[PDB]
Paper text:
Here we report the discovery of type IV borosin natural product pathways (termed ‘split borosins’), featuring an iteratively acting α-N-methyltransferase and separate precursor peptide substrate from the metal-respiring bacterium [name]. The α-N-methyltransferase [name] from [name] MR-1 iteratively methylates its substrate [name] at two residues, [name]-L63 and [name]-I65, in an N-to-C terminal fashion on the core peptide. Complexes of [name] and [name] form dimers of heterodimers. A five helical bundle at the N-terminus of [name], now referred to as the borosin binding domain (BBD; 1–53), serves as the [name] leader peptide and is homologous to a portion of the fused clasp region of OphMA.
The two other active site tyrosine residues, [name]-Y58 and [name]-Y71, were also mutated to phenylalanine. Both residues mainly affect the apparent kcat, where [name]-Y71F is more deleterious than [name]-[name] (~100-fold and ~10-fold decrease in catalytic efficiency, respectively). The overall structure is very similar to wt. Loss of the hydrogen bond between the carbonyl group of “i−1” and [name]-Y58 results in minor changes, including a slight change in the interaction angle (from 108° to 114°) and a deviation from amide bond planarity (Ω angle is 178° and 174° in wt and [name]-[name], respectively). The core peptide of [name]-2Me is hydrogen bonded to seven [name] residues via backbone interactions. Both [name]-Y71 and [name]-Y58 are both in hydrogen bonding distance with three main chain groups of [name]-2Me. The side chain of [name]-Y58 interacts with the carbonyl and the NH groups of “i−1” (2.7 Å and 3.6 Å, respectively) and the carbonyl group of “i−3” (3.6 Å). Kinetics analysis of [name] active site mutants support a previously proposed mechanism for borosin methyltransferases, where deprotonation of the target amide nitrogen is stabilized by residues [name]-Y58, [name]-Y71, and [name]-R67.
Numbering used by the authors:
A (entry chain C), B (entry chain A): 2 to 263
C (entry chain D): 4 to 71
D (entry chain B): 3 to 71
Amino acid sequence: GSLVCVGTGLQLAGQISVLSRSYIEHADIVFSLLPDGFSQRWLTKLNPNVINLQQFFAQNGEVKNRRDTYEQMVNAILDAVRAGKKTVCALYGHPGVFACVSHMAITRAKAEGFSAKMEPGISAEACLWADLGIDPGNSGHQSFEASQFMFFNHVPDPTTHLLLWQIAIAGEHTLTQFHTSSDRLQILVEQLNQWYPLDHEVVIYEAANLPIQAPRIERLPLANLPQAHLMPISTLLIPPAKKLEYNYAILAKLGIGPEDLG
Amino acid sequence: GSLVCVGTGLQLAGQISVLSRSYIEHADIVFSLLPDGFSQRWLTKLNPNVINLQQFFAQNGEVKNRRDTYEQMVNAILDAVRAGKKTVCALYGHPGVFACVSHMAITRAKAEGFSAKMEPGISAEACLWADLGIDPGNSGHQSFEASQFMFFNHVPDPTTHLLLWQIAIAGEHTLTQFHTSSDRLQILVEQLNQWYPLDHEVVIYEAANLPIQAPRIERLPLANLPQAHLMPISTLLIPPAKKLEYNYAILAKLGIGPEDLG
Amino acid sequence: LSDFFTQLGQDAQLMEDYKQNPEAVMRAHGLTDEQINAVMTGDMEKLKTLSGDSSYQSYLVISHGNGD
Amino acid sequence: GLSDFFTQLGQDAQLMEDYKQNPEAVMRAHGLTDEQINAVMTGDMEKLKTLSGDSSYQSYLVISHGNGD
């Protein structure tokens, strides 16, 4: 048995890598986590032997910690590998970007003596740079999970493009609800106000999943975030609050100044 | 005329999107910037109408500001679009990630009334998460261009995975040399020592371009960076210097403590 | 509907035909007036209705911010 | 023959999984010389480019700078 984890990207059918599609084609069995029924149908036509990982999230209002959902997904993947199957895990986006299940399954598979690897894919952030026409190198980039930004000590550089992922569950500490509350988002706004003014323009971004669909690019003042319509897939982009300033200390050690910059 | 900018990913032939390959296939003309002659041959077999953008870098020891190279690349692309050609720009990686030519060409094309868009691709950072088994969500992620970190005021969060891109030209202020010096990298080490101890293990990462090739994953103490062999494609990964610590301030506003986290 | 979206996502020729004339391309691939209306108003929920997925359930959060 | 093999191997998951099982057997079966196989097993990318006749071709892959506006 063996494991390869691939990404399908965000867009239906066309955003998967040529090699990653060939892995899906030739797999004994595929474990899928895909955005919609169009994507599910496309996959099933590629390879009919598919187990849908969606079944492991809480059903019908059940209280279930997402840590247990993820453990159950990893165990299901590993059961196929342990049985001797040439196993592919086909996740949306990039299988290792804000996605624990593939990293955990590859760690466990290697520890049990099986061949396991991860093929990179096109993530929501890769779609954002393209859709917004932003280079993360322009003034640099920072990414945090929104709840981790609230629960632990993180300090953003306000010259950079800042991304808070999973903004829809920001401050949902139980890992048992699918969305947060407007009061939790108001506390996030107050926290961000240490670096960003309340009238600072921010962007709610959602990558499109269908070729006929435009991405969501909603611009609003930070103050208005707790009243905004958010979906599990939403990411909050916080553009720079300040322009780049000259690092005189280091320029002097280099024996140059601003006027010497090419 | 029209412009679509695509990425080819880092690996030969297999890391391009299904859709992005189809755009190259059906283009009137392709402007290429690819890692090697194997990639160039693969492209030429896909579409024989190729102009190689490599020609616009300084040749034979010429002194040329890279800003001029990039202008000349953008102008070449736009001349095909202005002539009426259905134009594709095929860059390695992601065409908009630490890559100015495609964003500039798309801005200019839109301003002159032509249809222009960018298709996301698999970048070197996407390859790194897969190769190192690191999720940027785990403790967060920050990316800066190494020289921009030295020349302007950037403050890293030392709980995150920190990436310094283009580390091989760190401090090369003229934009006319292809690599920096040992003394420039020693100044970067002293600068980073504000947040990272001198014995802090860092990683020199290079994504593989050929399917028979292993990525470069070189672990060394930060102090040893200025003696390291670096190539233009090298990225410096600086893993966390500190574990995540509880944000008691925000937990108190949420009315919870660490013991309440799911 | 599904066959059309799958072809359109993968085929740059059809994508560039579609972007020139969305309604003409959709009509030629058999999409109903209601389906085309759903596309032109960006109503992804009604498109899923019209493709009949017996509400296919799709939560795509695969990480958390609680550490450990 | 080098370039044809690498292009197939990079795109085809079946050949990739055959290759990873037995690199030398797969490379011999696709006609690679003893020197080419040696270059692959030692990770000498420069010699492979020599042997394909390509590296001579100039590849600088920096498409951005850190000097601002």
